[PDB]
RNA sequence: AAACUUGAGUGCAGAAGAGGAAAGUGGAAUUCCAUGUGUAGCGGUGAAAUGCGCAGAGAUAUGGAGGAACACCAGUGGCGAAGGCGACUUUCUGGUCUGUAACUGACGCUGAUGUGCGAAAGCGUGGGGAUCAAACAGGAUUAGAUACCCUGGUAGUCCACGCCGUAAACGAUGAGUGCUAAGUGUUAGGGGGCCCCUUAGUGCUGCAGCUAACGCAUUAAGCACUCCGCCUGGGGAGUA
RNA sequence: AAAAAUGG
């Protein structure tokens, strides 16, 4: 079962933080047997409304495939304790 | 689901008959069969005839008009049912429209009509009246 | 006259897919109808969720 | 069930190969549907709609039991004691 | 007792859906709260008043708290046995339709008694509480006004688990099956050359036939067969 | 979009 993750970063996050934040959640991602078919950035967008008070955002999007949805729960909780992530979807196909 | 064969042919005669068609295709069976081949004797229906195909087999029946497009069958009614079957003696057999119409009947001496069924002296099943 | 879905062929609207979705999309957000943008209803299901999705991502706004 | 573990299912209680369509493989089914619904409603208690089908599916199961117990009573006792459903 | 495949199911290939249950995330607005500016009203009605404000209201800008419902899409559109189901995401799960004809071979229909679901209000325990609002309180209207109108406002409306089991719970039309002219829209499919055919729904118009009439009319209220429920003048009375 | 009852 394949899972498409996008999600958004505040836009104020340092270059070093972003890199350690993005990889710790695909990491999160891949835990529970869950391989990351492909992870990619889209960059700095312009928002179409301001979340948290933030006009723009990093976009990162994140394929995986699983048969359970164990590392997309992890992600969901870690990402509503995260202050970094602004928002958050998963869409299974 | 269907529960009267023999019923189910009659309405499908009498529908025909309402709308004038000419033809009539139905699934068959032998006790239809013989009904439909009393009906062409008796001169009620046109012509009769049997396609022995696959499941069922088909009887298709050829309904038969007078001059002015009169219909020769004037009706049809069911008189023993599954719901409540009824049988008659060979003193006690009807006599449809005074004469003028047949009782198709269910004997031991096969299915007859009423007047078959009085010379014979036997009785049975009273399947049908038509007139 | 024709829907831009069936003749073009594509069976699937992709919430990402701003360009399109702007398309159809009002001028002031509001889902434009299938009676004037001419599409299927069947393809009207998929590009409203699609919308909605977008909108929940940010992507397309509310208002 | 998954289409998988349907197709073992009918594997295992076929008359012989090619048969989908005995009693014995219909029922063996109803009993897995039977039973994955019985756990799902373990959990979700208030679905009604889902019950309902359920309820229908037992009905099918008995019908069934009922012919084959009919036409030969030696495969009905084997199949409810390898099921466990009596 | 023995055979058959059309009914009924199973297999295989597809299709759509606000079908149900449980978590999670959003944006608009209402209310309240805290600040900045600013002042003589705001609100409401047929007209007013109550009320709020001058102790600075209302308006306006920023933020915060909380509950409830999901604008646009949206359509005699869809799904469900009915009640009903409309933001989005994920998990579990029910049913329906289309095409093959491998498979079982009548295994079917109905259904008393039973057993379950069942709008809204209501009840119990616990939680929640924005809005709206029975009761209630003022203000009006009026001959009166235990109303309609206005300002507030408690239960309730919301949630979980129990209970209640009733509605003009309606298409005022029980279920199953087959047969009987046509025209036209729409939803989900399928086959053949924008067109033709076809399956299942959902609408409109319309023969035969039916009806007291109104009307129904392949989604019958027509023609038939099976089973169930129900009626027998009005009131007394859905009462004792 | 104020109010205007009743008639063996
Ligand atoms: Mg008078």
């Known amino acids: 079962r394949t899972y498409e993750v996008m999600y958004i970063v505040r836009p104020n996050i340092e270059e070093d933080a972003k890199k350690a934040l993005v990889e710790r959640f695909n990491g999160i991602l891949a835990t529970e047997g869950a391989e990351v078919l492909?992870?990619?950035?889209?960059?700095?967008?312009?928002?179409?409304?301001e979340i948290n008070d933030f006009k723009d955002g990093f976009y990162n999007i994140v394929r995986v495939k699983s048969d359970n949805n164990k590392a997309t729960d992890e992600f969901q909780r870690l990402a509503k304790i995260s202050d970094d992530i602004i928002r958050y979807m998963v869409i299974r196909e | 689901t269907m529960t009267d064969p023999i019923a189910d042919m009659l309405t499908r005669v009498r529908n025909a008959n309402m709308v004038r068609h000419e033809k009539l295709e139905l699934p068959a069976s032998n006790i239809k069969k013989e009904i439909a081949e009393i009906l062409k004797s008796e001169g009620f229906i046109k012509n009769v005839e049997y396609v022995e195909d696959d499941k069922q087999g088909v009887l298709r029946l050829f309904l038969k008009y007078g001059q002015n497009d009169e219909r020769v069958i004037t009706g049809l009614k069911?008189?023993?049912?599954?719901?409540?079957?009824?049988?008659?003696?060979?003193?006690?057999?009807?006599?449809?429209?005074?004469?003028?119409?047949?009782?198709?009947?269910?004997?031991?001496?096969?299915?007859?009509?009423?007047?078959?069924?009085?010379?014979?002296?036997?009785?049975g099943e009273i399947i049908a009246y038509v007139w | 006259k024709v829907c831009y879905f069936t003749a073009n062929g594509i069976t699937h609207i992709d919430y990402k897919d701003t360009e399109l979705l702007?398309?159809?999309?009002?001028?002031?957000?509001?889902?434009?109808?299938?009676?004037?943008?001419?599409?299927?209803?069947?393809?009207?299901?998929?590009?409203?969720?699609?919308?909605?999705?977008?909108?929940?991502?940010?992507?397309?706004?509310?208002? | 069930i998954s289409q998988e573990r349907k197709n073992e299912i009918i594997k295992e209680y076929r008359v012989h190969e090619t048969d989908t369509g005995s009693p014995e493989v219909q029922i063996a089914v109803?009993?897995?549907?039977?039973?994955?619904?019985?756990?799902?409603?373990?959990?979700?208690?208030?679905?009604?709609?889902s019950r309902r089908g359920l309820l229908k599916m037992v009905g099918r199961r008995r019908h069934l039991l009922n012919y084959l117990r009919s036409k030969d009573i030696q495969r009905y006792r084997e199949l409810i004691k390898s099921l466990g459903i009596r």
Do not use: C
Request: no cysteine; proline share 3%; net charge positive.
């Open chain 1, 38 to 49: 492909e992870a990619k950035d889209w960059g700095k967008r312009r928002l179409a409304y």
């Open chain 2, 78 to 123: 069911r008189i023993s049912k599954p719901g409540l079957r009824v049988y008659a003696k060979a003193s006690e057999m009807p006599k449809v429209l005074n004469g003028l119409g047949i009782a198709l009947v269910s004997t031991s001496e096969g299915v007859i009509t009423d007047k078959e069924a009085r010379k014979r002296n036997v009785g």
């Open chain 3, 22 to 63: 702007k398309r159809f999309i009002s001028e002031r957000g509001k889902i434009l109808p299938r009676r004037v943008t001419g599409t299927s209803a069947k393809y009207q299901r998929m590009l409203t969720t699609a919308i909605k999705r977008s909108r929940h991502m940010a992507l397309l706004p509310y208002v």
């Open chain 4, 30 to 49: 109803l009993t897995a549907e039977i039973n994955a619904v019985n756990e799902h409603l373990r959990t979700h208690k208030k679905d009604h709609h």
